[PDB]
């Protein structure tokens, strides 16, 4: 079916960076593939419907005549009630796959906008941050690997605290170009617009589905039998039944079940995206206690102020997801025992030297 | 069929770590793939159903009329018993594929929540622990080898009973970071909760399946014949049978066998999960006699006290499966002849140099 | 469906250079693949049409006679209206797949034309320009290295407003080699209009679609029944119905939705190509500030004069996508915010030596 | 068919070691795939059964009435014999594919038991044993070569009959870790239990198949006609045949041939299992003569006593299978001409020297 | 069809050794694939059989009654001839695919027997022989090269007829282990039995096929019209024809064609196997003349005495096939011009240094 091909092409699972959160990933699957899956079950496989409409034609009719009769009403679904002559339409029955595929394709717009308008600028400059925050450790592997050796002969903090203080606050161990970089991305507001827009389109599309099911569905929902007319044109001058009565919809159950499942999936989907939206309303202070002492991570910790709608929010949010690839997947992750003013300072430094990598 | 594609994408069998225990793999495979296989076998392959319901129409009816009749009841299963007019439903016969697919999808949530909420941190801990445990080889044979070489040069107390403290309490024998890490780890309880909840979800889903098969099934089980009505609408003003009796279900045997198989497989499946849960109720003391002599492995056996519900328990359980990968898949495993107080400790030592690796 | 094969072969997704604008790629995709999607949806999958026409033959006819009836009228679509004898044709219903396939294959013509007549000349110029423009490493920081060290010896305006006049006005800082190329390349006007012609081709194609839809469609839009004639030949000498009335078009709905979708998608598409056409109508000076300071990139900002219809426009626009690939972007990226005259001349310098890459 | 997919997934043919006896492999193949082959041939391909039952309905009945007739008997297989009213059922004809599939899944369980309960420990043991065995070469040719080189420099007792004791009881010729390892492993009884259960499960399963064929089959074996009844419900008040006689089974020949093939194949298979079981009842001394002269292989032949039910028997049986991989697939295998006391112990020597590998 | 799958799995076309004579390969291919090809051709593809039996029921019968007539005799093929009551059966018409599949499976037994019981030992022998004979190049040219270099310095007996003795009876020119190995393999008679059985089982199977075609075929070969009986049970008390004559077999042509092709192909195949059997009955000495000059190959030509049923025979037959892989595919193969007593031996010699390879 077309659903399988769409799922293969659409919604199918730099060079190492993770540019997309597992929450948003799961939301994208559960919002895109669900209508495709419902289409696949509905119009194939388990329920081979065959003819979606059946008619109780009079016995005098021939087989070809009955075929004409029950083929001339599916494209003319009109309830010719005796109550003037309010011909109520049941066009959602013939348009259900259309609506499902339209919803499926509408679900793919926000991810396209996120992939097109924000991925390149994000990717290039985060490659810049990862390409710069690897030599900060290379400083340590090349100038504090003897920090123990010059110290170990003598004692007292005069050979601990100030020996490297001017070798950590210097020309060699600094990155002031990044200071201006983060200071300025604190001011810009372009990248947050993509995220908020991505969430808002999914919200408005879910509301659109809600209203669509509210107006057209839920009205012809317990209706299964209607009377149609055939003598409404060139056939009016013929001696046969003026009204073909009791055309029964065979696929009412799948209609009801598809509608109910479509309601339920979006009802359970709604809270996840609002949680993702409120994720950006606060400044995260989970492990900032250790970030303030780390040399390069200190400037991540100091610019922790002001209104929480800034590009630095998104940058740090994506960093925390990429902070454990292979190299920061180290003592950074290992430092879980320093989470419990002269002894805490020296104990923390020996643990830093205990993980002396090579 | 959707069964083949679902089994392909879903339930399809770092870089070396074993993040799943084999019994868990077996139980997830059995509990997930079985509904797929049953629904595939039932509604395809050997028994071509055709139409699940057959009707005994009066001979006056035309072929198209009979098609309308047997199509207007497969979506309107309502037994018009003469006993007022208790219209008992027979919906599960129609809803069986939906029930199977919903059960299959529901059973797969626990593995998702495990792989998302436990894999990263647990993998980090395993990699760290194995990274410092692989060092322990050249710490008992590269550090203690001058013990028997000194033992032959002296006799008793100062050479074999007064050397076991100046060498064991030595800075090349002591691992502070690992001990502090284990001390911090055994206090944490975050990781075990995932294990308990993933098992409890399996139990609660099995109980829900039992409830579903107990209330909806087991009632329409020996019923194969039910009389329907068609003149319950505008067809009331027509000259034909008022109660079309004897619309017969065709797939009753399939219904029975599917229900019985679903009951039996989960009945035999239940005890494994409770066994897995109670595996954490005790401290494993099978081979601690050999850990307590090794430098690094003494710490693992030392912090075995108090209530066993801690992350240290699960981390040891998942480590034990990985102590036999390629490097600890060595002398440690070869140390099987040490399971049978001055001759014991020497005999334990030249066996160490027997497997001197290079 | 053959539409799947066409989408697989056509419209299927040097060695590093990007030669297509992403917006142009999206326009190409939505213009080419859409008619294939409508054709595949319309005549397969969800809607098993069967026979697009049905006939209400008299009951005297046999099965094969009715087969002759409904086969002799599908290929002879002529409404024998009683209003002299204007047999209106109903041929668009038959020719819809031909029209869709013709439109889809017509959409690909501008793509092949641009691929064949633009890319060959374009690629060499772009790669050459990149080859010389990447040279600033051994042009700027090697040749402007003796600026900061020179500063501290002397004082401000006689150390940084006198050595500029000789250093930049010196052979090794000069790039007139590129200057003759760029100057002679702007005299050319043969290739400037290739892009304009490429856009106008698809614009004329869209106009053709509009005229075809407004002329032949939109007339047979609510006509679903018609009376045919069978005794319009050698059967004229027979005793049967002369006007075999009531031939009903069962697939009118598919016709209406495909026509409406074809109108709507192109209606949304039209302004995008106009925007792309207007993109060439102005000088882009968004980041001209950074270009003029760097030696090599200074020439790019230098030659922005005259009418904006020049080849250099095409090179620069297709180059901005390729200028940001790996190397030239890195230096241009590190500045971004810097858009805010003696301190400015130096603060931009230690930023350059902050990112000394090795 | 499902049989093809089942054969694809299951029953499908470290890093170089052979963990399965070829006889056990062919036993597994012929014991698992045979019911799959019978399933594939019986209900597909050559004999498109269609409806496995046919009914001699009265001529007055309509087509749909006959469809109801032959659909209401296949799921209600009950012979309404006039002999009270012993309604003998013919359920095996329906349950044959289910029975075959259940047998197929059942007979594969011992493979899982062997793969899960014995493979890792066996692999560790064999890996240790070959890892130590490969070293035995440069200890009898690199280390004993100065026996014949000294032999011509002297004569008889002190050069060939007294040097074989000083040169055999030396530390370079001793393997005490091996000796203790095999001494401890011969006491264990865990590994043999898995193998004996593996054979016993096959034997019990074959006996269960014999009982199943004996009781339920072999009774409905020459019956092809049975009189059914339809007036056993709401059709009791109807004017039709009270005993619709003569329902004929179409696939009786398939039934008989499948039963005969099923019994015959396992009857042929039985002796191989008991042969495999009794292979453990004796100590194998086929080439023990050559083992006793090699340094490392002497200990293998030394612990050759007592009751043969030990894990040592299994480890040696599996060792002989991998004794010809790439390195022992050499001089040891070449040592076949030494199978035909002063000349014997020197003639066997220069043969070792001639095969000096590099 | 299972014909395609069976040809895919079986009959499908160390690391360099050729362990099968290609005549055996082609004869196995022809003997195994021919029944599969016949099965695929007969019951699929070109000749869409439909139903292998047609019945002439009286016109009073209904359509379902006629279907019961058709299906009540195909499984009860019994010719009720009026000649007492010899119910001659035509079961081979039904059992032809069964016979073809059984024959195809039976053809595979000798192949697996040879692959399992003889391949390892023969492969080991060939590996050892090739490994030792590949050293023979630098033993007749790098050892014997100082013959003509000395022959030109002397004249006749002591340089070309007395130096051929002290040099050919020299340690570096001798391969005693090869001679002893070949002598040991001469007495053994294990591998020859495998080849003899591999041919004998094929002969026995061909004779069995001839007997099968003789006894059951060739009797019902011109019979296509038989009269059956249907009132042979519960139908006896009915009013219809007692002898429902003329059930005509519509697949007699394929029966005759497949029988003729099956007998013809085996008749053609018979001589090849007996030729292969006789191939082992003589010592092959086609190029023994050039073998007796070479150092190591002289031993091979030496041991051709006595009865030709020995293992060295089969070894040399397998050698002559793989003597031309990559390194003996050299001067040895080039030694074709030396096939035409003092000038011959020198002429035999400088050709060796002419092909000095490097």
From Swiss-Prot, chains A, B, C, D, E:
PROSITE patterns the UniProt entry points to = PANNEXIN (PS51013)
Designated name of the protein = Pannexin-3
- Spell out the subcellular localization from the entry: Cell membrane; Cell junction, Gap junction; Endoplasmic reticulum membrane
Going by the UniProt annotation, this protein carries glycans at 60
A Gene Ontology biological process noted in the UniProt record is: positive regulation of interleukin-1 production
Q: Which domain of life is it from?
A: Eukaryota
This protein's major location comes to membrane
The species is Homo sapiens (Human)
- Report keywords, A-Z: Cell junction, Cell membrane, Endoplasmic reticulum, Gap junction, Glycoprotein, Ion channel, Ion transport, Membrane, Transmembrane, Transmembrane helix, Transport
Residues in compartment: Cytoplasmic: 1-28, 121-201, 275-358
> Into which family does the record put it?
Belongs to the pannexin family.
